[PDB]
Amino acid sequence: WTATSGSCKGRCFELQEVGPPDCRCDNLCKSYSSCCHDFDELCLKTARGWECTKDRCGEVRNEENACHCSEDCLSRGDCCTNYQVVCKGESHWVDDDCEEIKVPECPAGFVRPPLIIFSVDGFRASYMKKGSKVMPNIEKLRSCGTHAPYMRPVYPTKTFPNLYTLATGLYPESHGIVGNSMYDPVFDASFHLRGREKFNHRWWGGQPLWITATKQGVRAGTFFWSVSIPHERRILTILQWLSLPDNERPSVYAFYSEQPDFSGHKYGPFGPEMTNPLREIDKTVGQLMDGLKQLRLHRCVNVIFVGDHGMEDVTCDRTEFLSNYLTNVDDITLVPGTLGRIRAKSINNSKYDPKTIIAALTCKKPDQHFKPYMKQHLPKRLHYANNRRIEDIHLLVDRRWHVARKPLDVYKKCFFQGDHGFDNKVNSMQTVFVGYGPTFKYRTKVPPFENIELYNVMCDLLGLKPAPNNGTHGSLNHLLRTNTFRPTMPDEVSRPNYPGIMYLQSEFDLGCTCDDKVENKLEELNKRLHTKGSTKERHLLYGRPAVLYRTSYDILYHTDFESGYSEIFLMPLWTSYTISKQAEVSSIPEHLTNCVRPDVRVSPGFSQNCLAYKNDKQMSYGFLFPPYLSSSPEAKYDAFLVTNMVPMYPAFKRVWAYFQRVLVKKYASERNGVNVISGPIFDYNYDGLRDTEDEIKQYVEGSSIPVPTHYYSIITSCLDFTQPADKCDGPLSVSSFILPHRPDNDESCNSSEDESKWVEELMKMHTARVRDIEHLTGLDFYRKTSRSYSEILTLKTYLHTYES
Ligand SMILES: *[C@@H]1O[C@H](CO)[C@@H](O[C@@H]2O[C@H](CO)[C@@H](O[C@H]3O[C@H](CO[C@H]4O[C@H](CO)[C@@H](O)[C@H](O[C@H]5O[C@H](CO)[C@@H](O)[C@H](O)[C@@H]5O[C@H]5O[C@H](CO)[C@@H](O)[C@H](O)[C@@H]5O)[C@@H]4O)[C@@H](O)[C@H](O[C@H]4O[C@H](CO)[C@@H](O)[C@H](O)[C@@H]4O[C@H]4O[C@H](CO)[C@@H](O)[C@H](O)[C@@H]4O)[C@@H]3O)[C@H](O)[C@H]2NC(C)=O)[C@H](O)[C@H]1NC(C)=O
Ligand SMILES: N#Cc1cc(Cl)cc2c1C[C@@H](Nc1ncc3c(n1)CN(S(=O)(=O)C1COC1)C3)C2
Ligand SMILES: [Ca+2]
Ligand SMILES: [Ca+2]
Ligand SMILES: [K+]
Ligand code: NA
Ligand SMILES: [Zn+2]
């Protein structure tokens, strides 16, 4: 209940919202049906429109007008944005030459350059080039400031998940807004775009920018605007707030446009109807910048132009129906559209079985346009599992398609031509980033980056300490002229042991055999030098990874590779090796097929055993350093050490053997050598973070050998590919992956074919950042390069996407 009989007199767009039952005058009161009775009259004035004309110049102030062209307007802070242009012979901001902003040029009493976030819904990255002729204001921000060719949203590429990731620096799994629609089983409550539940604070986790600011003594404009407040009024409200007294004036503001998303849904991303919405957004930018120029703030404010997600061509005819797959369609609830989320319609139904639903959805039709996943099997780069609001069963929908439960859902609720929500690596989902102002660089292009990184930079622009978030603070220092964040590398927590030869072969009772009895003090000296690390500079190019947790581990050197061997997990945390462009692939000799050799540097009690793999009828083994890439027949024996062995499902060994035998050589050929770091990952609670030993749900039968959930590889070379990976003087180039360790290839519908037709496709789907691998292993890579630490942070956030 609201007492709407109070008044908005002197309270229009007040910054502190009042508590029910008192009536509201803030920019969200309409959305709560809580505005005072006189809000429209006083606060949403329209008379005479948004623009000064030659006949209004010097007019007698009339308080009914939407904006003023009277001599007193600059002093009151409520001039029409074009006042100085029409009435005082000034130029529009867009007509002025770009001039470098080396220092903030602020009015007296400004403590810091304000930040204005200009957020646009559905603004696809390619609009910057394809619409450039109709967006001169946006084009000038872009060419004069700092811009990325695109900015990667988070999955799912929906509005609220992305806007709240911009506000928090958190993945949706961590902030709690995991969709535009959600069921929380603990609350037994549903979140929807329409209605009141979505206003309850219990949905919204982490700490958004406006709260971070307020807690650190920085005032904030309210970021959310009720849909019926016209854009012109939003901009006039921000400009009036910027005229408030010093002690009352916010330092951070947001503008929001529902366009171009609203029109994109109706007309498709590139419908001829899309030109007008782009022109109108550009005009709104023009109004802001002309208004800042009037207040002498156009060389003071940092402006960010940012989108939430792009827009793809999607039509009602490109819908898959679960009713064409399942017998039991009335027993499930589907969250539908550009992703699917499935749960039981009733928790009372004991016949519901996720295993049977997955199997009925798996490679059933030859061109199926969706793929089912248990959420823990989704590509780790999506970070979309660790939340009770994310259903166990997920459908990754192909770009251009929808999934629905039954046909009547699509025509009893069409005419839409655009949609978004797909995998956040799809080109059509990419969105925009421009930064303009004293703190941003001048005429600077930066590589594409993820939207989870922006919170940290917005905190830097405002002198704020960020709440704990998923950005990597410093990775975007190259966007900034000043206010850079200069972090120190994390301290190593565990120092390695360097074991020498300590065990006789007869002490090992592992049930292993190797045909390796083949008896020269030239080569006996050499053997010893390789075991002490004489080749370690070729194979460990960027230093030893640091272990950032308490554990027991050994560094093991060999001719062709170096490893950090965990005495707790009985396998390497990491294996590092370099493959030159000239390197030769060889076979595993016939006599060495089943060869496993005790490591006389490592106790029997800290070793795997072959008898466990023999008894485990589901589990086999592979090697981290591939025997196929041995430098010599003699060096190949090293690759069959028990300390190089890791547990692998036979189905996964098909993937791993193709990677090691074919793809490593291919990358060294293409990139002029590569350095490879490979290893296991254990994430049984799918939280994206390294498991402790007590979290492991599967062992090799009858043993303490834990079974990885994933295998990673980090593949590094010289960005200037005219230099070999091992003699690179400049920046690096990296690609990585985190491959699910699965006992079947059900994910790969073409897996009955030769690995050359499916394995590289799988690996591209499971592309990762080095930072993703850092979280999952507790390792810190690239500790010893010639490069600046911020540059290394940028490299560790790189994702190789494989989009054209
Ligand atoms: C991205 O970046 C984020 C932020 O840095 C990071 O997420 C953080 O990771 C930590 C580990 O997973 C975790 O630390 C502690 O969590 C709780 C404290 O939780 C509350 O307090 C903070 C501070 O304000 C809140 O932010 C937090 O918000 C979460 O929950 C809200 C309400 O439930 C919700 O609105 C919000 O969205 C958010 O949900 C998310 O996180 C939770 C977990 O906190 C998930 O469950 C959700 O799914 C969602 O993902 C809370 O209100 C501490 O209590 C923990 O300590 C436990 O657990 C330890 C075991 O490892 C143990 O040592 C401790 O002694 C203690 O044990 C006790 O409790 C156990 C579990 O209940 C029990 O089994 C045990 O036997 C014993 O009784 C953690 O220290 C942060 O909360 C988390 N923050 C946020 C904002 O998410 C991410 O990891 C990265 N992601 C990547 C990939 O890097
Ligand atoms: N969180 C956050 C955040 C972070 C930044 Cl950096 C900027 C902004 C926001 C919030 C944003 N304002 C805003 N105002 C109103 C509305 C929205 N956003 C989104 N909707 S909607 O209902 O989802 C949509 C579909 O029909 C309209 C209405 C401005
Ligand atoms: Ca949106
Ligand atoms: Ca984990
Ligand atoms: K076996
Ligand atoms: Na298959
Ligand atoms: Zn939309």
CA distance 475 to 406: 45
What are the percentages of helix, strand and coil residues in the chain, rounded to 5? 30, 20, 50
Atom of ligand 1 nearest to the CA of 772: 93
Other beta carbons within 10 angstroms of residue 373's beta carbon come to 23
Residue 158 Cα to ligand 7 middle (Å) = 7
**Nearest-CA neighbor of 687 among 800, 571, 772?**
772
The gap between the terminal CA atoms of the chain, to the nearest Å, is 55
Show the tokens assigned to 764.
């591209």
What are the CA-CA distances from residue 570 to residues 226, 492, 656, 704 (Å)? 58, 21, 20, 8
Is 599 part of any known ligand binding site?
no
Q: Which residues pair with 342 in a beta bridge?
A: 334, 393
Is 460 marked as binding a ligand? Answer: no
The strand order across the sheet containing 444-445 reads 252-260, 115-121, 302-307, 433-436, 146-147, 444-445
Rama region for 343: left / alpha / beta (φ>0; ψ in -120 to 50; rest):
beta
Q: Which atom of ligand 2 is nearest to the CA of 454?
A: 6
Q: Are 428 and 269 in contact (CB under 8 A)?
A: yes
Query: From CA 295, how far away is CA 289, in angstroms rounded?
Result: 10
Is 575 within 8 Å of 677 (Cβ atoms)?
Answer: yes
Amino acid at 58: G
| Closest C-alpha to 193, from 130, 240, 134, 261 | 261
Supply the residues annotated as catalytic. 159
Sign of the Cα pseudo-torsion (490, 494, 500, 501, in order): negative
Q: Cβ < 6 Å from ligand 1: which residues? A: 170-171, 173-176, 205-206, 383, 386-387, 468-470, 687-689, 775
Cα 66 to averaged position of ligand 2 atoms, centre (Å): 24
Q: Given the CA of residue 304, which atom of ligand 2 is nearest to it?
A: 6
Cα distances (angstroms) measured from residue 615 to each of 34, 612, 620 = 70, 5, 10
CA distance 118 to 115: 10
CB distance 438 to 299 below 8 Å:
yes
SS3 of 70-137: CCCHHHHCCECCCHHHHHCCCCCHHHCCCCCCCCCCCCCCCCCCCEEEEEEECCECCHHHHCHHHCHH
Instruction: Determine the Cα–Cα distance for residues 168 and 456; give it in Å rounded to an integer.
Output: 9
Residue 217, judged by CB atoms within 10 A of its CB (0-12, 13-18, 19+), counts as exposed
The token duo for 778 is 């507790």
Q: Count the neighbouring beta carbons within 10 Å of the beta carbon of residue 766.
A: 20
The helix or strand, by DSSP H or E, that contains position 733, with its residue range, turns out to be: strand 732-740
Contact 314, 418 (CB under 8 A): yes
**Position 116, amino acid:** I
The two tokens of residue 274 are 């899309």
Closest C-alpha among 638, 499, 637 to residue 555: 499
530 token code pair: 């390789």
Render the burial of 677-712: b for 16+ CB within 10 Å, e for the rest: bbbbbbbeebbbebbeeeebebebeebebbbbbbbb
The residue contributing the CA closest to ligand 2 atom 16 is 224
Residue of 380, 313, 369, 308 whose CA lies nearest to 339: 369
Q: Which amino acid makes up residue 132?
A: S
Length of the chain: 804
Residues with CB under 6 A from ligand 2: 117, 119, 159-160, 163-164, 166-167, 193, 223-225, 254, 256, 258
C-alpha 359 – ligand 4 centre gap (Å): 26
Q: Are 159 and 256 in contact (CB under 8 A)?
A: no
Q: Taking the mean position of all CA atoms in its chain, how far away is CA 157? A: 11
**Angle, CA of 86, 92 and 95, to the nearest 5°:** 135
Atom of ligand 2 nearest to the CA of 164: 1
Residues 6+ apart with CB under 8 A from 661: 585, 626, 628
Q: How far is the CA of 588 from the centre of ligand 5 (A)?
A: 19
CA dihedral (442, 472, 726, 528) in degrees, to 10, reads: 160
The strands making up 562-566's β-sheet, listed across from edge to edge, are 553-557, 562-566, 571-579, 674-681, 710-718, 732-740, 767-768
To the nearest 10 degrees (0 to 180), the angle between helices 159-168 and 454-461 is: 40
Minimal CA–CA distance to 219: which of 76, 112, 302?
A: 112
Strand ranges (E), 299-422: 302-307, 312-313, 319-321, 332-335, 339-344, 370-374, 393-397, 402-404, 418-419
Inter-helix orientation angle 136-144/275-294, to 10°: 60
The rounded distance, in Å, linking the Cα atoms of 182 and 177 is 8
Q: Which ligand has the shortest distance to the CA of 186?
A: 1
Which parts of 493-552 are beta strand (E)? 546-547
Based on DSSP, count helices (H) and strands (E) in the chain, helices before strands: 23, 29
Ligand-binding site membership of 92 (annotated): no
CA triple 680-684-686, angle to 5 deg: 100
- The answer to whether the CB of 512 falls within 8 A of the CB of 609 is yes
Other residues' Cβ atoms within 10 Å of the Cβ of residue 603: 14
Q: Is residue 423 a known part of a binding site?
A: no
Ligand with smallest separation from the Cα of 193: 2
Chain centroid to Cα 488, Å, comes to: 23
How far apart CA 595 and CA 609 sit, in angstroms, is 12
Protein residue with least CA distance to atom 1, ligand 2: 164
Backbone angles phi, psi at 718, to 5 degrees: -85, 130
* Cβ-Cβ contacts under 8 Å for 708 (sequence gap 6 or more): 646, 647, 680, 681, 682, 741
**Cα 307 to Cα 122: distance, rounded to the nearest angstrom:** 7
530 is in an annotated binding site: no
* Cα of 399 from ligand 5 centre, angstroms: 40
3-class secondary structure for 222-263?
CCCCCCCCCHHHHHHHHHHHCCCCCCCCCCEEEEEEEEEHHH
For residue 99, what are its two tokens? 């001039």
- At 781, list the tokens: 């890579």
CA distance 417 to 263: 10
The pairing of strands 182-184 and 393-397 is: unpaired
Three-state SS for 212? helix
Strands 115-121 and 302-307: parallel
Tokens for 569? 């997990």
The set of residues, in sequence order, having a beta carbon less than 8 Å from that of 629 and lying 6+ positions away, is 560, 577, 579, 583, 585, 586, 660, 664, 665
Measured distance CA(632)–CA(558) in Å, rounded: 12
Q: Identify the nearest ligand to the CA of 122 by its number.
A: 3
Strands 553-557 and 732-740: unpaired
C-alpha 81 – ligand 2 centre gap (Å): 24
Q: Are 558 and 536 in contact (CB under 8 A)?
A: no
Experimental method: X-ray
Protein residue closest via CA to atom 21 of ligand 1: 206
Cβ(682)–Cβ(778) under 8 Å? Answer: no
The values of phi and psi at residue 171, to 5°, are -55, 145
Q: Which residues line ion ligand 5, judged by CB < 5 Å?
A: 613, 616, 620
Label residue 407 left, alpha or beta by phi (over 0 means left) and psi (-120 to 50 means alpha).
Answer: alpha
From atom 24 of ligand 2, which residue's Cα is the shortest distance away? 258
* Chain centroid offset of residue 58 CA: 52
If DSSP codes are grouped into helix, strand and coil, which group holds residue 342? Answer: strand
**Other residues' Cβ atoms within 10 Å of the Cβ of residue 29:** 23
Sign of CA pseudo-dihedral 232, 233, 239, 242: negative
Amino acid of residue 5: S
Structure tokens belonging to residue 617? 């009828």
Find, among 316, 322, 419, the residue nearest to 365 by Cα: 322
Quote the Cα angle for 9-221-31, to 5°.
65
- Identify which of 13, 123, 201, 223 to mutate to test ligand 2's pocket (most ligand atoms within 8 A of the CB): 223
Ligand 1 center to 174 CA (angstroms): 9
685 annotated to a ligand binding site: yes
Look up residue 453 and give its DSSP letter.
Answer: G
3-state secondary structure of 759: helix
